[PDB]
Design a protein around this nucleic acid. Sequence first.
DNA 1: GACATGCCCGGGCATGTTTGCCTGGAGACTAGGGAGTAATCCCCTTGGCGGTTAAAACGCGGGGGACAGCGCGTACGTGCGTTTAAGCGGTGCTAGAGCTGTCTACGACCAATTGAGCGGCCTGCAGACCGGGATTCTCCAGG
DNA 2: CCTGGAGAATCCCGGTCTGCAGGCCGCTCAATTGGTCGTAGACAGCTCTAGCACCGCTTAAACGCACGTACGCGCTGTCCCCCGCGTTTTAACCGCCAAGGGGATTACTCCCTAGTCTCCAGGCAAACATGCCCGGGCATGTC
Lengths: 82, 82, 91, 97, 200, 200, 200, 200, 108, 108, 97, 96
Amino acid sequence: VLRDNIQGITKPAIRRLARRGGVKRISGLIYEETRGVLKVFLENVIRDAVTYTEHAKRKTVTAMDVVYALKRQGRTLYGFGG
Amino acid sequence: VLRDNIQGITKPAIRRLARRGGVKRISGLIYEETRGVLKVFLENVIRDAVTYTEHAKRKTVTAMDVVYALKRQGRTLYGFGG
Amino acid sequence: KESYSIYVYKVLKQVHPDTGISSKAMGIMNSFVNDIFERIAGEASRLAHYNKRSTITSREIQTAVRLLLPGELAKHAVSEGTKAVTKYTSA
Amino acid sequence: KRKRSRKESYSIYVYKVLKQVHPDTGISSKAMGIMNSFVNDIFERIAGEASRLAHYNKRSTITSREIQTAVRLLLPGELAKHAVSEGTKAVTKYTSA
Amino acid sequence: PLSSSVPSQKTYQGSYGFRLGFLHSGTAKSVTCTYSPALNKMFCQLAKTCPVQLWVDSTPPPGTRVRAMAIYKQSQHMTEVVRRCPHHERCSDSDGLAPPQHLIRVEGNLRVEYLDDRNTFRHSVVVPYEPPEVGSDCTTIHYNYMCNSSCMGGMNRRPILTIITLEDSSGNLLGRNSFEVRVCACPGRDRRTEEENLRK
Amino acid sequence: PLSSSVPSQKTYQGSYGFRLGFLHSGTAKSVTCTYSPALNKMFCQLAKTCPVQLWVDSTPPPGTRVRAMAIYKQSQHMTEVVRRCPHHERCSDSDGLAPPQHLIRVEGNLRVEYLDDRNTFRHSVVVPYEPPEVGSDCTTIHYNYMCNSSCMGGMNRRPILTIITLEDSSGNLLGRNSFEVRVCACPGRDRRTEEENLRK
Amino acid sequence: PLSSSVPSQKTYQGSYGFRLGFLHSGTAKSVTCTYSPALNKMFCQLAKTCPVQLWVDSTPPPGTRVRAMAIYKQSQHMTEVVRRCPHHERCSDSDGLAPPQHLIRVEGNLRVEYLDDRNTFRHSVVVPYEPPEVGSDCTTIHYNYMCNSSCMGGMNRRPILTIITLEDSSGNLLGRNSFEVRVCACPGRDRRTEEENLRK
Amino acid sequence: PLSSSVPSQKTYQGSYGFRLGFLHSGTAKSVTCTYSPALNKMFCQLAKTCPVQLWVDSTPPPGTRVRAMAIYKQSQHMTEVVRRCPHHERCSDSDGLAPPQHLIRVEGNLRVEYLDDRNTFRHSVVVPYEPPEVGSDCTTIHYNYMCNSSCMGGMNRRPILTIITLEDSSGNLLGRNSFEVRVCACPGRDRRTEEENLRK
Amino acid sequence: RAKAKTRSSRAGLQFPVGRVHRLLRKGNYSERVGAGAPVYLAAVLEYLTAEILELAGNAARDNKKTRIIPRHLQLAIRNDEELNKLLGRVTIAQGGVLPNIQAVLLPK
Amino acid sequence: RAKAKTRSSRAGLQFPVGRVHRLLRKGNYSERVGAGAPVYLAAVLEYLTAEILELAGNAARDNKKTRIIPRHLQLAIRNDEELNKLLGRVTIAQGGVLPNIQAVLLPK
Amino acid sequence: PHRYRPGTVALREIRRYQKSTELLIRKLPFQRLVREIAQDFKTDLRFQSSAVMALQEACEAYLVGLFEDTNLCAIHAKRVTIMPKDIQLARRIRGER
Amino acid sequence: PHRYRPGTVALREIRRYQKSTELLIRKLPFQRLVREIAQDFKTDLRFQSSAVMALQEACEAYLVGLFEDTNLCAIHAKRVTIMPKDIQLARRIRGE
DNA sequence: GACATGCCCGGGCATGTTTGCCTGGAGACTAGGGAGTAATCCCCTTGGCGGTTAAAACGCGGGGGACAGCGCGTACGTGCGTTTAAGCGGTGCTAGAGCTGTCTACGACCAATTGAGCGGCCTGCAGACCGGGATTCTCCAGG
DNA sequence: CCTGGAGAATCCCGGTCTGCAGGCCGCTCAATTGGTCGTAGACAGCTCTAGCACCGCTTAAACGCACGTACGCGCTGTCCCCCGCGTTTTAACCGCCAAGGGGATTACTCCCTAGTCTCCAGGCAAACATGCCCGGGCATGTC
């Protein structure tokens, strides 16, 4: 039902993310490489979040499921509970 | 009672360590920079190890104290128990 | 669930009486209190396990404070924690 | 005048499993110490993660489901598949035995 | 105003067995006076005749007199002197014998005396007693009420009691009787309606 | 008593378009006040509030005063001075500002004055004038009547007309308006009834 | 303010057997007054009649006077003086005989006196004594309370006790009796309410 | 007492777009102040804080002031000075700045000015105008009402309007607004009842 | 049966000691908890809470804002060297970053 | 009393089920432990133990040794990316390193 | 005409985004990406409105931290333009993959 | 005469040490270094023989792993020689 | 007889205080954990002597680091045009969240007995040494 | 400069010899296992409700695409100096050996602390108490 949404991360979106990090000049091959890295990170977090949802026997993913998924990877997140 | 033992880490010893890391050519400024990094590593590990020793009110640093000190810093050590 | 929003607000008024807190800024503090709580309670739990002891005293928390907090913050925290227990037992 | 206190280690079971994959291969005490640290480590991870699963879900008992979910969160994808299979057989057989 | 005392209303027949009596008028729309035995309550209009019979077992001695006075039935209002309301006190309707402020008046008797007590401020009308004539066993006196029960300021819808007393020369008490009164408009209507609830 | 003349009730707006206005109160059984345009008649309770608006095409000069006076609407009784009945003239209900015998009063206004003419024998109450806000179109005055239209001796169920007159600081006539009034116990019930009687 | 002492409420009949009495009124929602024997408590409205009987085995000597005083029933408020609230203290409702700040009054009687004690700050009203009728067996006095029990600043929703004391010419105590009182807007409803609660 | 004039209540935002603002409080049992936009009416407790924001499109000149005066919403009661009741006028609850008789009080402002007009006897509180602090869009004033709407003698269940006028140093009018107020014991319970009745 | 005293006020702290005594004794942190253990930890959490709020307030005054927001908590954690270690891997919502620009990128 | 039978025998495992049951009850992991909990965990620990020993034995044969030493455990773990990730933060005593030389350093 | 020299506009962007705090990835497209990845593991999965934001803030915080290190690696080689080598090196040094 | 070109023996040492497992730093000079650092936190401390070995295995494993990253940083800069700045970058990227 | 007019009772809202439930702290007793003492004795510290590897030192010279120059290509900046993300609605219902009942489940204890640990010996593997030679690396002629 | 042959050095292989570790056996105590009992955490069904999902239209901020120019990266050459390799000399580490006793450990006894159980006080919400207002019906005067 969903396809090619990875392209939604447009080039300006990758620029602004690199801009906040101090980047001044970017090459063309950075965009394709960035999307590949983004998917791996987002994918690993989703698999862990869904794993908690399945254990809880729910059909909806809550914020806490994402917090626990990030936390165990050394990504303690504040703001959405804890 | 004792001073200038950091110099004990002779120059050939730093070479052999770099050899395992695949280093083929070393510069003279590496030996002074390495001794600084090695000292910081020991201070953090030794400080935590002594902390576990003082808590137990013991006067001899055992292997378990070093294993615990290394573990919490994100580096587990197998072989010396624990 | 029980939140520390009432106490995080009082502490600020004792430091900056004329300032407020936003809804999100308060939620961040709640996650901060719980995080630091789990670390100290977690490390203090292992200290009692390593020494083959069951009860968690003020020493297990004091040592856990040194292992977790840096050198500067640890000493100030140990000072406050010592007075709180020294006053409680003495009163 | 006791001689020594009582200890415990997996050196007996690590030696048994070794002769199931290589019946004609030994293992040194140094290599054995590495295996003991490995078993104790993996145990702390699973038990540590299974403890939080029961805490988040507000349960007070650790069942085979908490361990099964903890294994899927710790081990990689491939090792998790085979690990879950072996665990499923043990509980399945133990219930029938 | 207010009086310093309250007259007496204790029924007293006396040695001569004094008791009252009334006629048997109807209850039509055009009736002036009518008495209700079941209620001991007279229904009459303003300033009209009110025949009242005087029954006695024996004839009192000569000089006996009959006095009539009105008081408020309710105790809290007894101290208030029953008089004509401020309106009917100012209007010009005096018969030359009754003062302008007296409520009760006796008609057809020249020997009538209206008393305004100096010590009690009460209004009363007195007439000599006469034995029954030939063919009657009771003497009749005709009274007149100069204010409706609903006159504001006077009675003000408060029911009253007409105190009839048989007295001697020195004013002593020979017999006393009383009965409720309701000076109103259209009395037959009221007596009929009143007696309809009586049977219910 | 009877007056030697009859006040002129002819409407006179004057050089300032002096007129009157009233509110839109309902007709509840015991509504304190209520005005009927179809009858130009006011229905209020005794001693209660009586709102009356003042409409003018131009703001009169300062010092202008408003006087109120009562007369009988029926020509047969215009010569009689409208006064409280002998009953309500004797009771103690003076607010300190109004004499006892006066029928009309004004509440809420400190600068009120009551007059008892020596020649015509009429009563009246006067109050200064005040303009409304630039957005409003009339100023309201609140009166009080101290007798019911059915007060025997006083009005005696005879309708009355409250004549309002705008006057300068010297008392000269600037304007004049009037309106019928009925002081009763059930204003709304009576207004609704009279309005229904207007159709019936 | 607060008084220096608390008047005694102990019942004392005396040599003349002084005892009180009340009537048998119904419990209509808004009955002006009514008494509850089960509660020994009176329920009345503000400024309305309150009959109180006087029972005695023998006629006291002449000059005897009856005094009435009010106090709070709750022990934690007995030391306070029972006075009218600041609101009903300013309103102009004096009958000419009673001061403004007195709670209890007597109607119908012309020889009434009101006292404001100098040492205790207590208020009270006094009236002479009168014997009953020949056939009667008690004398009735009619009091009037000038504040509701809920008057903030005065009683303030706190019950009170009206102490009646039979005293000689100088003030010596001949007899004493008391009874709780409640000044409310719906006496009948309130009596039924309390009596219904008493069933429990 | 009474006043000699009636303040103005005409809405006028002026050149600076003067408008009022209120917080978005709830309607629980523990709410002390809450504003109902559907009614333009505020619900608050006695003596508690009542924040009132001041919104303007542009900053008025220096020296501008803000006056707050209460008047009875009903015309017949406007001339009556809105004051505390005789009870809450005698009790000792003054904060040193506000007189004992004033109804509205401004807390947390030393430049507050309570005015008891000698020519109109009106009560009012005035404070200088100040632009919003850094990070705010409106200026907030803290008011306090010292009597419930049901205080007998004072407001006596009569609604009141809170006239807020923006004026310069010379008192000239720059802007004016108003909103009804109800000082009760249960603001939340009362707003629910009133609003729920508005939904019906 | 003397009147009660909240164990938090009994130690001069603002955080609830009673709650910490329940949390430490649950979640399977230990078999037994000492009477002085909750008091000690409650004071530690209160101190660290005051440090962040104090630094955050100063960050708010720098922007002349009368309220603390998530951004002010970020600057307070990253400017302080010690807090940057205790909270080095923490991610704050709408925290942003510091205005750090490498010198080699600046113009010249 | 009947002839007892070890729980590990019922599950056909080599590791002990009784010992794992204790360590689960203690250590402050939870208040209660299910019967099927230690049986499931004992099977997982036994599997991972066979994976390392199997690869270690093969590494020992490559060096013509008939005895596993820490050096063989190291080579076996790193040659399997799955175990390398599981033990990516473990230091093996006397384990050594892999013989990896960057191609850019080789001569020509 | 006028045209800002290359690099000047980039500097003003670095300062603006480093000073702001709002999200930089469009919310809706990211929400579809999260569901396109989750469907591969389980169909009919629902997400809370807060759960999606928790993922986005974590991803942006990761990429930003990645670009910072990627920028230093480019400076170490005395380059100003970042290239895939800089990203791969930074992720390799930290043991990411 | 006979001798090799620079880079030959240095490369041959890489194969030799990467194949072995023993320690590459002298033992006694390491013990005095640990005690010189330990006395700063507490005086009169004692160590077990195994405790010191645990520190060496941890230090060598750390430095060796640090040189691997350092070598990559040097290769990234198109160099072969490692420089002090190469070590600083590898540490900073690792949050040290 | 029909109508006109006022007062009493009943109903229902309006308004403030009393009563009931949940959470945290106080008071008291029982059993185990912790503390202290006495003792053993294993392990760390220390010092000696001799042998020797490893470290230190100096020297030469080649390879790699470095700076400077030139080419051109990839990137940035700007403009116009196209797209769809945000916003603000409306509508439906799935699924989260909480409650109440009941049961199977694990904790707990006691009694019985096998598994695991420690201490005690012997052979095979691994290490060490010496000689042979096969492989790797470097420099010199030929083309 | 490129290719091939010869010399030199290192590494690998094979045989012999020696010492420590691995593996096994025997014995003893505690822990695992059996089998009862008890209490309740968790499953289950049930319900209400919130929050998510879907759809629509409108605004316009953001994303696409295309063109123009230039700073930037890359390759090249040429210094030159820094590090490697080698031999020589000096220093400290390893090894084996022995002794002293401080500190960790174990065992035994006693005292204080924490857990468990029961009861009271403060905070929050609903019910009761009581004054005020409106309408209906009857009472009573007028026509």
